A paper describes a structure:
Previous studies have demonstrated that the carboxy-terminal region of the V2 domain of gp120 interacts with α4β7. Using site directed mutagenesis of gp120 we reported that a tripeptide motif leucine-aspartic acid-valine or isoleucine at positions 179–181 (L179D180V/I181) in the V2 domain plays a central role in this interaction. High-resolution cryo-electron microscopy and X-ray diffraction analyses indicate that the three V2 domains appear at the apex of the trimeric envelope spike. In high-resolution structures, the LDV/I appears partially or fully buried in a way that would seem to make it inaccessible to α4β7.
However, when a linear V2 peptide is left unconstrained it can adopt α helical structure. This is the case for a crystal structure of mAb CH58 in complex with a linear V2 peptide derived from HIV isolate 92TH023 gp120. Additional V2-specific mAbs that recognize helical structures in this same region have subsequently been described. We report here the cocrystal structure of a V2 peptide with one such mAb, Mk16C2, that was generated from a gp120 immunized rabbit. It binds to the same helical structure as CH58 but approaches V2 from the opposite side. Thus, mAbs reacting with the region of V2 from AA 153–194 recognize at least two distinct types of epitopes: those like PG9 and 830A that recognize a constrained β- sheet, and those like CH58 that recognize a less constrained helical conformation. In an ELISA assay mAbs 830A, CH58, CAP228-16H and Mk16C2 bind to cV2 92TH023, indicating that this cyclic peptide is sufficiently long and flexible to present the epitopes recognized by each of these mAbs. Again, Mk16C2 was less effective (~47% reduction).
Numbering used by the authors:
A (entry chain L): 2 to 27, 27A, 27B, 28 to 211
B (entry chain P): 166 to 179
C (entry chain H): 2 to 52, 52A, 53 to 82, 82A, 82B, 82C, 83 to 100, 100A, ...
Write the structure that this text describes.
Amino acid sequence: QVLTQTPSAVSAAVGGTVTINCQASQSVYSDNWLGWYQQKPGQPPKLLIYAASNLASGVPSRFQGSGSGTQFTLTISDLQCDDAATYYCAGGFSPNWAFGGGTGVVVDGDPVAPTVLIFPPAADQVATGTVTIVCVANKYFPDVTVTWEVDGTTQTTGIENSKTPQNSADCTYNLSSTLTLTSTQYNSHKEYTCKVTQGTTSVVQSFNRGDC
Amino acid sequence: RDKVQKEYALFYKL
Amino acid sequence: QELVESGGGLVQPGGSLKLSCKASGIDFNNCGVTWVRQAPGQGLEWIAYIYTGLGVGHYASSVEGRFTVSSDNAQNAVFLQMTSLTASDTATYFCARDGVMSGVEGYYFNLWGPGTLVTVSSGQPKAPSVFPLAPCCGDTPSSTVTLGCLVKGYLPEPVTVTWNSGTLTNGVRTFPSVRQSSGLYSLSSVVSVTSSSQPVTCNVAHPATNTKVDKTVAPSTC
């Protein structure tokens, strides 16, 4: 069996409405064997709708299930930040189940400007011949962009970012940017800057090698 | 096995 | 009312590995126990099923003949024996229990476990190198302050980070790991605390290499 899900990702604002279509390659055993699971990063899935259209115990009324046979639809109303996650349709076909490909739901909330923290390498990092500078963007929404500057020179390599899931309460993000380079290069400079731009607004946080 | 239990058994084939 | 799966870890291509799913609050008497794996950054995949009632097991085509679901009721727990493994089998394996609810809702996976991560590859394990994350010694502080720890250069992911042996959890931000070019992973974890006379330490654990590191993060680089 195959439950083709559409769309694969959707971006909706707080209070809006999102629709997820689940097309099955063949009729399920019966409408009593089609459910929707909500999964957030690092957590196990959670039953949301059972019997194709029955609200699971403890699920808010914002979620509605509809369909039958092979075409099913999930509808999320009054979209909240707590609904930020990935949704899967699972259909039973007698002996086995089948999960859809999943649909990531991103929730647009109130914009928030981020705060930036820069962390110089620990005292015992240069000893290993490798230095990793860490920069964090705290509590923010509309995705940001990070640029590393070493003595006014923009870095183009040795940068890798990681973003946390959206906060269940305010949709906000949290990002960490790390700049790794040779200990010989870390000592050939002094000013290390982390700039986080949110559109056309920038937040800068720097440190001088001769002070930490 | 009642109604809810037979469809379950018939489903997984018990 | 709880479930825990154990047995995950690094394994070579072709080797075997037996996973277990133990209950702690309920029993596996006359109910279905399902296994669902999820590759890193991928979707859910139904693999196997077993009914503890009369030991009826079902397996997906991807694991046809290579895996085996067991239900040794001694110390109520279900098992999953994996024979010839491959890289594609790398994923987080969950176990779910049905019948917990009443009515038709009982057909579905009501109770889930946290999941156990299995890594299939020939790479050699390597413990991480925890480094402190504190503001430069020449920065303006205040009533609070953000400290963290850097965990880089480690193979088989499953790394658990905590603060103060799990007592300091409010305001903890552990970012997702990132597989670097050299194949080694690395992550960071920062925490916001009110400055005082309390020991702020990060407890880094790497079950793959059986290592536990505790790095007392100083409030400054001095």
